[PDB]
Amino acid sequence: VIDFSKPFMSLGISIMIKKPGVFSFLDPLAYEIWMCIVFAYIGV
Amino acid sequence: KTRHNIILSAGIFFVSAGLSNIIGIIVYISANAYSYG
């Protein structure tokens, strides 16, 4: 129904998604493990 | 005051109480599998 010129801009359908602690070296073991390690050290 | 093995028994009792405390803490935490009060 209307005349289009050549595309002045090209686009497509795209996906938009939403985009270390100081003591993070303790992260491999849980906090309870460290606490029980201290307790076991005292007991030993 | 002449029986010295009573003090030794008290020390053994305290150390054993600590060891049972450790075991109870481990049992409680493992059975829970938040914050601690």
Distance CA A19, CA A16 (A): 9
Which 3-state string (H, E, C) describes B9-36? HHHHHHHHHHHHHHHHHHHHHHHHCCCC
> Residues, chain B, total?
37
Per the listing, tokens 């601690």 go with: B36
Spatial neighbors of B22 by CB under 8 A, at least 6 apart, are A36, A39, A40, A43
CB contact under 8 A, A36 and B22: yes
Nearest to A36 by CA among B24, B35, B5: B24
H/E segment holding residue B37: none
Name the resolution in angstroms.
Answer: 2.9
CA atoms within 13 A on the CB side of A27: 6
Give the minimum alpha-carbon distance from B12 to chain A in angstroms, rounded to a whole number: 12
CA atoms within 13 A on the CB side of B9: 4
This structure was determined by cryo-EM
For residue B6, the 8-state DSSP code is H
Give the minimum alpha-carbon distance from B19 to chain A in angstroms, rounded to a whole number: 7
Q: What is the DSSP string of A1-44?
A: -----S-SS------------TTGGGTTS-HHHHHHHHHHHHH-
